[model samples]
Target: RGPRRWRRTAAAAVLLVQMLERAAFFGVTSNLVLYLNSLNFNWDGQQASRATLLFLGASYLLAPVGGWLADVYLGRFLTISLSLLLYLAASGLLLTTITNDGRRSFCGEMPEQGSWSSPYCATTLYLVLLLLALAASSVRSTLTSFGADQVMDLGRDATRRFFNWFYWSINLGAILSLLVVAFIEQNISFLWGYSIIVGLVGLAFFIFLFATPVFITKPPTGSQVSSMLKLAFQNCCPCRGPSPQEDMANFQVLVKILPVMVTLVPYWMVYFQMQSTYVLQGLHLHIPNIFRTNPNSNYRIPEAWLLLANVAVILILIPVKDHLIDPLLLRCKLLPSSLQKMALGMFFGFTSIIVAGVLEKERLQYIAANQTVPQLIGKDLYYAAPLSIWWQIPQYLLIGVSEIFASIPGLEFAYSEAPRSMQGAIMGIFFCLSGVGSLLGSGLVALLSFPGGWMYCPKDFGNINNCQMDRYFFLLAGIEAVTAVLFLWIAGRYERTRQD
Candidate 1:
């Protein structure tokens, strides 16, 4: 029948699944380190932050594997279907790992210090996280491509409007998870808290299956990444002086874009810290009662609530930029190129950490002067900070504005610059860089731990006065500053290569 007017149905299906899965992801990840602290696990700030980023890294690094499978065998439809089922099983496994009373781990039943690594904890939890990682790989690598496939088939105007709502959905899902799921985990019980996302994911899975017939199922053709490797091998062979012009051309573009991808690593390192160091830091600060349940109720804020500032900024700015800021800048002949925006994003990211460094120094000074301590590492609502936590809002907001400019543009550039054959492959490359960022973050934690004044010593075990938390922030800020300059130079060189 005519091309089947099922494109929008496909878009809706992917969107629903994305929103649900992301809700599930942020729901668990947003408060994971904090939740771990609540248990008897003796993790400090640095340990929790590093572990979270490493887990994030491993999950996203597999995106290429997922993309290859989707492009070679399963196609977007089947790959996504299989991924959702795996995710469902992982979600169910998480329920068993945590204790039923929900305040502690299953290991709490050992009748002692509640050793989390004991027999009761079970090795299945790690296995389940690995399974969830695979599921995320399949979903992230293929789902966006699936959504784009539907929109692009509908013609020009539809495709242009698609990116707008697409970005909104990410922030919308983030805010809801950070608020609702996080609140429940902190106040109510952890079992019911995580169960919400499990239900939503199951619901979305059914919707995707329901729309299978109506949706446009795109089969995998040839993989762009595979083609490039072939081109490299074939071009310089004894029989061939040069390969086909198209392969050579795409090879050059991919090489040129490599720096841009590398440049994205540090921003993600900082962004990952938002859920880790940022939230944990907030818990130690004097967070005012922004939303109290009653006048007399001593309702101190949950640290996860602080992330809403950045999410709120994104939720507000995206529409304004799409409608007003972009058009206004174009009219004034001052609109930045995509590369320019990302370099600015890099700068803004660097600036956010610099702000963090100064604030940490200030917090340290107050702590030393007052001879006071906040017992917020593993526990919540026991004490308050000498300085108000609202000071952190500036850094959070700045990162949001930076993402609005840089991160989204990186996706558009990945799609725009790559050859037609390699769009999905290039998008997978973009996702993979975030994994590199997470790896770099984990590496830095180890790297900085060497014997020096810069190493982070635990405030619990060592002298808190000279633990040097501020030094760590400043060091990352320095790397980011250098990375931004190099990115700007690379972008200029890439533009020239394209022009030539």
Candidate 2:
């Protein structure tokens, strides 16, 4: 009954859920730090950005925890369902926190400036962030592996298509979050936007629930991670004999993939910038107001809207790569291997950062040349250069292009390389490593936000214009470039070993 293509409906169901999940997630996170740094919360740029990364890292770091729960007890189905329940809870909490009354009580409109007076508000917000992270981590940990499970027998070609579409789904959700939710949050009210996000999650849970019976899910196996650790430790200790041949073989697969995993860290570190410094950078560039009617009220482009460039490039390029570039490469006998694609992605990432550095340097030069004064963007001070926000498109597009190669292929590679029992575990590890990148990125920002540091521009709240942002971009570029070379060398060795 399960020979091949029956799981088409199953795959679609998961994909839909994923699209909505991403929408809800990105809807909040895309503008979360900015929200924190807004008048309602009133955190500094350094505090807000770091807190955001920490939340990001915590969510991904819990991937393995989710994996363990899935593999050892409830399986992916129940884990996902339970996580969705928590997701709903967290989203509700967020909605309440940002509502008009909540905002009024939490920040008090009277003071007009400085931090929020209530520690209770801060506590609730952070707690909600943690809860959201946990809920998201568990769901993300299993969803991809679970989706792959639905199509296990659908052949390699089908599986490859699934990964591509799955990634495309992420960006689809991102578009909604970046454009719709971001506009609402920035221009309208946070309450209305978060309410929409909560409804999306509710819809996602309902859809996922309705399609439950059709999915071809694996039963809960014993703890894959626990068993692996025990096996490794027993082997290392002189007291125990060698582990099972199959177990050792699986361990070797992980060992081989380890270098690839390490190299991906820098890629993520660079990508994380899009959410952090890149947005900060955009705040300093010219945002053309499409609204000309209200002269007294200057309605400039929302900073979050610039992120649409990344989404636009991905949406445009994915189909092109899938339909045209890939086929052309195949026809030319030059189809790149997964490793090769990952290498190319790393290089693209490096180039993107280099572009960012150059742009930032030039922006700084423009500031010096013109003596651009700091102006209020929201309540916070900012330096808006004459350079158009469109100038930032290349870097955003490059990062998006890099994702086509690095992220999709990387996830596919992780799933394909692992043993059947360890697919969830391996996927979790892939996500956890990304968490590592987030953490490292956070640490870097924290370090560089100190006095005499590259990010230490204290003109006002959320100000980044005078900071050595160029140097920061260049530093990331260097790290990413070196890691790309390392990845190529390691990939070569791994490929040769596999051939032997």
Candidate 3:
């Protein structure tokens, strides 16, 4: 086949693999809290939140190892396959074990076990689940790099399209999984739902294995394993002399950007809350189903389902922005370059948080009054009483628009900023920083828990019953806004060294 045909086929293969993987992943992750709650894990809110942080942190720490393996021994294909197999085993175990009686009986339980035995089994099960997550993370870290590798020769325009579609596909899969798997979890047995997700993953793995020949692998240069070790030590100590093709000017530019990355930690901390704390918050709201009443009364909308709004908005906006808005702006000499877009994205990200804060305050009031509110209130009442679950739709939509502009562009920016030889390392660094952001998110939650001499409560603490999340959201927004402005100023001073 011609190179163009080959690239197209490879893109299809990668997209299919990614879609299925995301479906399976979100299916499991979206239901994690509910699963833990069902198991009656004896932990308070703070403890449970910390557990999530640690789990994500531990999973992220494995990224470099995953990257090295892909770059060295297994290559991307084999590493991804191995990780999928691990995921299959983990999901299968989770489904088979844990009987309806909340007893560990997949392998036939120990008869008349004491309290300690039950706890031990539960702990063991949690560990197994964590192992599964680690495996998933390993696969996740390599998947994007592998996908990019497949279509690298398509040039910059196509590459930009690929990134947009890549993110879009993930959200598409997430939406479908939430609709299907979430329904199963709510109506049917949780294990059965998980079994279905595992089956999808198994299918995805087979697709990948069969499609491997179509993918082009770029072999590691002198083994990524050795390079990582050498770099780790080098970073710890003082730097040596300039290497081949080393540009002091470009290095200086990167140095300037490094401090800017520190400011982004807070933005990410709040941004990630959409999946973590926001989901929990959604559960407390009174959600109505399609039927509006009857048998569905007991069935409330899953918090993760709300994320679909964000995805839907992104899907609708990406095409419009890329095809229409961008061209129009360019024609009018109004469109900014990639760097400027990134700065604007960051600013929009801050605005998104501000919008979220307003929504939260309104939501708190609605909860206080025990009244049903509309999902999307008018612009005039943006600060009015909280509407219904539907009222949050605008905020979700706004976040989606902001993320497409901010997060997607940020990834492209990082990739473009790095030297071609060091692209993988730079991407790895970005993922690592995001992992740190996740930890920071958890830390922020912990810090927010302490207020003067009193503990800030999600529920009523003393006479203060309102959820304080609004204040935190606004604080994060303001911080990010300032950071974006600073980054823009710094970027202006730094000369552009890389040409697209």
Candidate 4:
């Protein structure tokens, strides 16, 4: 509205879209496994957990394609706008899956029991998931790069600040979904909860579209990655496109940082557990009633409520660190470099998993000593222990703090360290690797699902009490420990090479 000064406003608009998208994203996917295990689907823990993780894996794994498309064809603005529309369509289809009448129309019949809901219904559901994940991956792979473009003129500090605040907005949206949408879906109905999610996504799409005129849009650079690879191999493909010495230099920049990214895979593996395993653990623990007025009513704490620990800690720490911790460190000459901060975060993530393992051990002990109660979720009965859900807070808090160090810096590095032409490609590669982390997590779940394995539950995999989840937690912690050591060594070597 007021000349080019509105770039500050443009950046704000980007933040708003991020916040709204996360609200929509978490509202639907946060309780994703629980939805599958409910009465409508009756999926066991293995089926539900594996499916949910695979969905997340697909969402992340497709980042490179979205990034490439944005870099080589549609600019970031057009790609994001189109993907948001795709997101809207996916949300509409998902809304139908929550209701019985809707299911009947879509798939012919709704099952009261057994895992097979209906082939048509299953096909339709997976189709929607594919669309949703593609939309998410496309938007995710490019949105940050788009947002960063707006702040580049403001210098490095502004770009860094934008990344931190961008992350803060994301968690803020997550908290809203966890507290509100989860409560609605659990206590009220998925129809209403999902309906609200669909509405919010629609609203975000419109808001972003309306602000398009003010955006500082950039045109595609004809795929820096393709050029880099082609030039590196000296026209190996059919098309002998013009090559540049700069492309070779950019490829080396990526190669040098590859080790740092590889080590963060374990960190992502640990981080995703909050969505699946931690939620499962909460289901088995004692969930207290919210109100004393209704003694016979089933108004207990929602399992999604347990996820608040992560968001809450993030809400507090991001600002505190930006203002207090960073300033203090700088004054004392004790400030950490990006790689050093990432290593510290890896250490914290390792410690958090250890805490989770100890908590799981205590939970197992308490369950062993006491008689178990069968709690009904959907059509299946799950075994519950005497342990409290509050005890899991320490582990969640550690993970939240770890993100402040590991994830934010990683995002910043992917954008700030890369050359101007390759930001989208580099960002895409970062997310694609994180998706590998998600896939690794899914693979671990599959591996432990063997008949007599630690994560396997007899009769139905829904009974987490029968599974030795403590050992799984410990094993993940061990992987993180090893990765942390490797990250420290690799980071030091990279720093030395850069200095030379």
Estimate, for each residue in 1-500, the C-alpha lDDT of model 3 and write its tens digit: 57767688889878878888888888887666566555434333334444555667767666655665555556677778898898888877777664545444443454342334343345656587677767877777677777777657558767777777888788788888887898788666787788899899899888888877777776543324344455545546774523422433334444554554555555566677654555444444545445533221434445456666556766777777788766687689976767677677776677677776777777777667856433311111111243556766676667777778877776676666655434554555566667888787777666767765222764442222344667677677777777677767656654443331
Q: Which parts of model 3 have CA positions greater than 4 angstroms off?
A: 39-50, 98-123, 223-263, 274-286, 289-300, 362-386, 451-455, 458-465, 493-500
lDDT of candidate 2 over 344-385, digit per residue (tens): 988887878888889988898887888674434443546677
TM-score of each: 0.82, 0.88, 0.82, 0.87
Q: Write the per-residue lDDT of candidate 4 for residues 1-500, one digit (tens) a residue.
A: 57555787788889989888988888878777777767776556666666677687778877777887788778899999999999998898778767677777876665443356432356677778878988988887778888999888767778878888899999898898788888888778678888999999999899888888888786567535556675657645555522456666677777776777787776777677544687778777766555533322545456666667658777778887787876788799977889988988888887877888888898888888976765544334467877776787777778778878888889988887787767887788888888898788777787788878887786655677777888888888888888788888888988887897
How many residue pairs clash in each candidate at the backbone level? 0, 0, 7, 1
The residue-level lDDT of candidate 2 at 78 comes to: 92
TM-score, candidate 1, is 0.82
Q: 1-500, model 1: which lDDT tens digit per residue?
A: 43545766667667777877787888878777775555534445555554566557667887867776776657778888898888887887677656455314444543252235432333444466667877877787678877877777456435545666677787888888888888787777777887887888889889888988877765455534566788767766777522457667767777777777877777677566544566656666765544453233224344566676668777777777778866677799987888888888778878888888888888887877875644432243334348886798888778777777776777777766766556666777778888877676767766766767575564445333456768678777777787788788878888888898
Worst 10 residues of 4 by lDDT: 292-301
- Model 4 residue pairs with clashes: 39-378
> lDDT (0-100) at residue 46 of candidate 2?
58
Regions of model 4 farther than 4 Å from truth: 1-5, 33-50, 96-118, 224-228, 231-243, 292-301, 371-386, 459-461
RMSD (Å) of each candidate, 1 decimal: 5.0, 4.0, 5.7, 3.8
List per-prediction Cα lDDT, in the order shown: 0.70, 0.78, 0.65, 0.78
- Candidate 3 clashing pairs? 373-387, 373-388, 374-387, 374-388, 375-390, 375-391, 376-391
